[PDB]
């Protein structure tokens, strides 16, 4: 089974991953305006699975700018599916070989989509306007079962994004945390035991995103 290690301390917010995800999946741009921030769109939507979140933060009297390239965590025991399964076990596929949590178009037939979205501790899944269909990151399932890495990972220039077998990614995350713990005494991994997409932050996770950890 697969995993990701996302080292936010190496992200330059180049937005290569955000665009790359759209390019690979054929996702359209969605309506935005500038409301006083460089981050856009403001949040995940049906057509946007990878979102580079950007937050200015004054830390120890000095300005910093914290980046979080958000996407589904591919929870080891996915609550979105657990909920959806009460209605239709074929709506959200849990792929044994990769660990991918795959929202399918079958979500359109769910009578209770709200409960599926609220079950996500990370507030990730999104519904298209015209129906109950929902979508989110598909771990680039087609690429990863065809000898390629995810589009966002391939696109990333600084090694912030990493992909591989879960164990290797878990080990990588731990080692990287160890390397900065001294200097960044508030650094931590975000729910490292519960998810497949593991983010390292150098400060309180909530300074990166309100839903960074469960």
């Amino acid at each position: 089974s697969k995993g990701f290690f996302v080292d936010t301390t190496r992200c330059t917010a180049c937005r290569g991953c955000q665009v790359a995800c759209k390019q690979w999946h054929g996702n359209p741009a969605t309506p935005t305006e500038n409301t006083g921030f460089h981050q856009n769109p403001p949040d995940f939507n049906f057509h946007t699975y990878k979102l580079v979140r950007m937050h200015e933060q004054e830390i120890d009297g000095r300005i910093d700018w914290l980046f979080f390239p958000d996407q589904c965590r591919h929870c080891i025991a996915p609550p979105c599916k657990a909920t959806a399964d009460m209605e239709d076990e074929s709506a959200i596929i849990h792929d044994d070989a990769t660990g991918c949590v795959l929202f399918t178009p079958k979500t359109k037939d769910l009578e209770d989509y709200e409960s599926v979205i609220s079950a996500c501790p990370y507030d990730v899944p999104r519904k298209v306007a015209e129906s109950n269909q929902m979508a989110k990151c598909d771990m680039c399932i087609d690429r990863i079962t065809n000898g390629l890495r995810p589009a966002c990972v391939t696109s990333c220039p600084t090694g912030a994004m990493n992909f591989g077998d879960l164990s290797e990614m878990e080990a990588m995350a731990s080692a990287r945390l160890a390397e900065i713990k001294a200097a960044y005494s508030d650094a931590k991994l975000c729910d490292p035991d519960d998810v497949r997409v593991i983010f390292l932050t150098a400060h309180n996770p909530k300074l990166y995103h309100e839903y960074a950890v469960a």
Partner: protein, 977 residues
């Protein structure tokens, strides 16, 4: 598993990103039935990006597969308010007629002073770094055959200062090292740049250096995406950089942190300066206060019996460059720098200490800077200061060192190499002027002489390059006659972007090519630039999308009925639909291939040029007018295949050059028709062509070096990441120029762990990189040469007497307003600048109290034409914005995201406020100076609510009303809308 990839049966080709100068490789997948791209992503095997791409490269598919690309040529008639679609044949023949008639009407054979100039004064051209090398070369060739002298593009604006400064210091204007080499740096100083946003993939290598223990430093008035990764971030007031840099020079000299052996061996520190040199209260000797120019002869070196500069290698002589430097820099103490820059002394000292530690022989510091101020009277000396500091620390020619003067566009290096600037032909050969009537006088003027046999003085080869360039254009003419075909500029007249638009405004320019540029957004003072376009009888605009320039006649406040200009809009191909080369910031010339076909019915530039040139040649062949020869004799057959179409392989071979007749050079024999193997073999007698001599060696009898994808490296090469088998770098594949300075006089590396070159005594050859100068080590007095082979004596210039504003950098205040005095001398502003109030006190209008700067964001490109028309990028940065401090926002009652109006004396525009802690006011002399910032990526043509050009607010760099924008600092007001 089961899942098929969207790409399985697609044609797979390679390309190189068409945005910035990093040179990232791409892989393109094209549907074999539709001939359209179905995927565009990074090439995992490319050594620079390893498949990574920033937002811009990643969005490439959307650039090509774009419904906003006009499918057909568009014509706008005089006074009309709408485009009319026309056939390619109608457009091409009509343009040909306009070019022929307008050329004839404005062509000067003999000027009023009686000089033969053979010059067309009524047609001008801008563009473009967006074109392939092979397109750029035939474009300048065509334009010159027409007699044009007004030939400019991108490079004039952001890299002209760099070329001037670095050529003075090192002998060439190019970036000295290359992208991958950044990983070898011990300290990376990013100053006057923002590489994480503007050269994003560079951060792969910058972060690899950091992983190795490197210190990363960013010095910028704003905290940016780059700043987030740096060990040291230092804010400094706009335009105060010279103080910061000269303070570093003082620190280096006084603390003896310089690398003495390197300074003695490879710089002009030992040169004895003549008794005429002096400096007093801000003025060097020789200042003429009425002309505001210096008599530079006052600054020359004292010469020996042979006419070579005298040297004191002990560096003790009171007039040696070194001692003159010690004296000159003593005034730049830290307290003064902190006061004028606004940067805390403690932080300056941290930067100095960290950076100056690289003066060790086995350490390397690099400086990454990009545009800097556009005013040369601010920019040139700032780059000189950086260059000086690098020489004192032994950082030039070594791995992880250099002045990494980052290029802008993907092929701005190439468009500069190919002479799309008024003052140079391809290969950096000065353009003919009215007072140079014959070819013999031309070669005599431009061929430097040194009587010192230890100096390579490589430009002594000039006549080989001029002959070869001239023959590449008119191979059947003799050189004297062909030289006369080249248009000659009026003596002392500027034909650059600086004045091209002023002259257009004054009615002097009748026809204009806006070829792959958007001057209605990119030129200073857009309101006036846009009005200047109305003075034109015709304009040919060649671009991917309709835009602010091609459709200027329907822009803001324009009444189409009152605009007489005929506009021909020719939709062109995008990069992944083209085959040719582009040269990156590291001088890597990279071959690209067609993926999807040119989207119907767009045409690639090369073919557009071929079609126009041939039609114009046929008109002049039937009706010659005053002087048909340069036009009809131009060898366009060299540019096309047997079917009459643009052939990039043929043009690239011409650029490289080939034998026109059999000849022998040394032990090498050439037969007519054979490609020349190196510029060292080119001939002064007319025996060879070469469109651009620096490219000789790129496409030889052994093939297309730019198409090579060989990752083989020796252990030595691999240690520093040269990848000499990957594509090809000019000159002659020397990846790190000035590399002879990375070794001692014996040829032994100063940094054995990251050596660039090393002399192999048993084989009489250099190993590692190609040596920048192949001769034996400098200790060999009989056969060896000095390190800086393009300089007249072989020594880099610390003291550089060629610069019009002084042989050493000196601080002057860059702006009139608000009035800020500086503590370094009684000379307030640069004494060679002409736009300042002198006799009177500056009169600063309170209507425009804030300083506004323009810069970029990662997601947009240039005027934004390309990226505003790319949905994924526009989604991320959808509107003009104004970044401002909390303090200023509070003062003006502005809240985050509010619409605000920016106004200057030139015009006004709206933006969305971005209140940020990343900008703070500067405090200088009891005064709180506020600077705000805006991007220059927007324009009225699209989208509807995106905003317009930042240049609506800007003035020029000088007395011009339009032209080169002073883009970094100008006065405005900001008000809540």
């Amino acid at each position: 598993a089961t899942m098929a990839l969207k790409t399985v049966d697609a044609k797979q080709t390679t390309s190189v990103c068409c945005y910035c100068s990093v040179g990232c490789g791409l892989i393109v997948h094209t549907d074999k039935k539709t001939n359209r791209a179905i995927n565009v992503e990074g090439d995992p095997d490319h050594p620079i990006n390893e498949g990574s791409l920033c937002a811009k490269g990643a969005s490439t598919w959307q650039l090509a597969e774009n419904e906003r690309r006009p499918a057909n040529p568009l014509y706008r008639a005089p006074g009309s308010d709408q485009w009319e679609e026309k056939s390619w044949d109608w457009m091409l023949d009509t343009i040909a007629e306009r070019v022929a008639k307008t050329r004839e009407a404005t062509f000067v054979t003999k000027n009023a002073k009686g000089q033969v100039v053979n010059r067309c004064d009524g047609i001008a051209s801008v563009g473009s770094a967006a074109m392939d090398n092979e397109e750029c070369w035939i474009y300048q060739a065509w334009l010159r055959s027409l007699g044009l002298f007004y030939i400019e593009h991108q490079a004039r604006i952001x890299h002209s200062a760099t070329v001037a400064a670095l050529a003075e210091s090192y002998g060439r204007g190019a970036m000295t090292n290359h992208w991958i080499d950044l990983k070898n740096s011990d300290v990376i100083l990013m100053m006057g740049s923002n590489p994480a946003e503007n050269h994003p993939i560079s951060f792969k290598w910058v972060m690899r250096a950091k992983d190795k223990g490197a210190t990363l430093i960013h010095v910028d008035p704003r905290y940016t995406r780059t700043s987030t990764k740096c060990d040291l971030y230092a804010p400094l007031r706009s335009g105060s950089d010279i103080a910061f840099l000269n303070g570093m020079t003082k620190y280096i000299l006084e603390k003896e942190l310089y690398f003495k052996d390197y300074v003695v061996n490879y710089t002009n520190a030992s040169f004895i300066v003549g008794e005429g040199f002096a400096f007093e209260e801000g003025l060097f000797a020789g200042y003429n206060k009425e002309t505001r120019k210096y008599d530079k002869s006052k600054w020359g070196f004292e010469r020996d019996e042979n006419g070579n500069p005298k040297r004191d290698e002990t560096l003790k002589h009171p007039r040696c460059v070194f001692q003159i430097m010690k004296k000159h820099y003593e005034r730049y103490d830290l307290d003064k720098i902190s006061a004028i820059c606004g940067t805390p002394k403690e932080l300056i000292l941290k930067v100095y200490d960290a950076y100056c530690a690289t003066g060790k022989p086995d350490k390397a510091g690099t400086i990454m800077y990009a545009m800097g101020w556009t005013q040369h009277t601010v920019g040139v000396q700032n780059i000189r200061a950086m260059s000086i500091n690098q020489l004192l620390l032994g950082n030039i020619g070594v791995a992880g060192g250099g002045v990494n003067a980052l290029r802008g566009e993907a092929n701005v290096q190439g468009s500069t190499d190919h002479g799309l600037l008024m003052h140079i032909y391809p290969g950096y050969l000065g353009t003919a002027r009215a007072s140079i009537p014959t070819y013999e006088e031309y070669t005599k003027k431009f061929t430097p002489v040194s009587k010192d046999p230890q100096s390579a003085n490589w430009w002594s080869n000039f006549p080989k390059y001029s002959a070869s360039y001239i023959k590449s254009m008119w191979p059947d003419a003799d050189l004297n006659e062909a030289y006369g075909y080249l248009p000659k500029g009026e003596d002392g007249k500027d034909y650059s972007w600086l004045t091209l638009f002023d002259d257009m405004f004054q009615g002097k320019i009748k026809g204009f090519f806006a070829w792959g540029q958007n001057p209605a957004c990119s030129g200073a003072n857009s309101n006036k630039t846009r009005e200047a376009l109305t003075k034109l009888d015709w304009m040919v605009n060649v671009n991917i999308f309709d835009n602010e320039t091609g459709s200027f006649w329907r822009g803001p406040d324009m009444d189409p009925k009152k605009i007489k200009t005929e506009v021909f809009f020719l939709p062109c191909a995008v990069a992944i639909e083209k085959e040719g080369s582009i040269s990156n910031s590291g001088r890597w010339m990279q071959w690209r291939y067609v993926g999807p076909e040119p989207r119907k019915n767009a045409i690639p530039d090369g073919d557009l040029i071929v079609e126009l040139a041939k039609r114009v040649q046929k008109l002049l062949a039937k009706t010659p007018g005053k002087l048909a020869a340069p036009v009809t004799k131009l060898k366009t057959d060299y540019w096309v295949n047997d079917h009459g179409h643009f052939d990039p392989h043929k043009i690239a071979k011409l650029i490289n050059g080939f034998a026109l007749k059999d000849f022998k050079v040394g032990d090498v024999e050439y037969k007519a028709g054979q490609q020349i193997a190196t510029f060292g073999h080119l001939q002064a007698d007319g025996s060879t062509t070469s469109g651009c001599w620096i490219y000789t060696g790129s496409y030889t009898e052994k093939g297309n070096m730019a198409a090579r994808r060989d990752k083989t490296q020796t252990d030595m090469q691999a240690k520093i990441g040269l990848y000499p088998g990957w594509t090809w770098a000019w000159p002659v594949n020397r990846r790190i120029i000035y590399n002879r300075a990375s070794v001692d006089l014996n040829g032994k590396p100063y940094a054995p762990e990251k050596a660039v070159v090393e002399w192999n005594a048993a084989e009489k050859k250099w190993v590692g990189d190609v040596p920048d100068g192949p001769w034996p080590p400098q200790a060999d007095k009989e056969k060896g040469k000095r390190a800086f082979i393009m300089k007249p004596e072989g020594y880099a210039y610390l003291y550089g007497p060629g610069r019009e504003d002084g042989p050493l950098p000196e601080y002057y205040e860059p702006m009139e307003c608000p009035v800020i005095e500086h503590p370094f001398s009684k000379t307030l502003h640069n004494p060679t600048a002409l736009h300042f109030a002198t006799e009177e006190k500056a009169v600063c209008d309170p209507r425009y109290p804030f300083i506004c700067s323009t810069y970029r964001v990662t997601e947009h490109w240039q005027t934004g034409l390309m990226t505003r028309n790319t949905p994924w990028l526009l989604e991320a940065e959808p509107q003009m914005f104004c970044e401002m401090s909390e303090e200023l926002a509070t003062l003006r009652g502005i809240k985050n995201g509010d619409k605000v109006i920016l106004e200057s004396v030139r015009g006004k525009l709206w933006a969305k406020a971005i209140i940020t802690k990343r900008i703070k006011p500067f405090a200088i002399q009891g005064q709180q100076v506020h600077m705000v910032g805006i991007p220059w990526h927007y324009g009225w043509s699209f989208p509807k609510n995106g905003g317009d050009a930042a240049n609506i607010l800007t003035p020029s760099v000088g007395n011009p009303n339009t032209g080169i924008p002073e883009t970094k600092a100008f006065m405005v007001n900001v008000t809540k809308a």
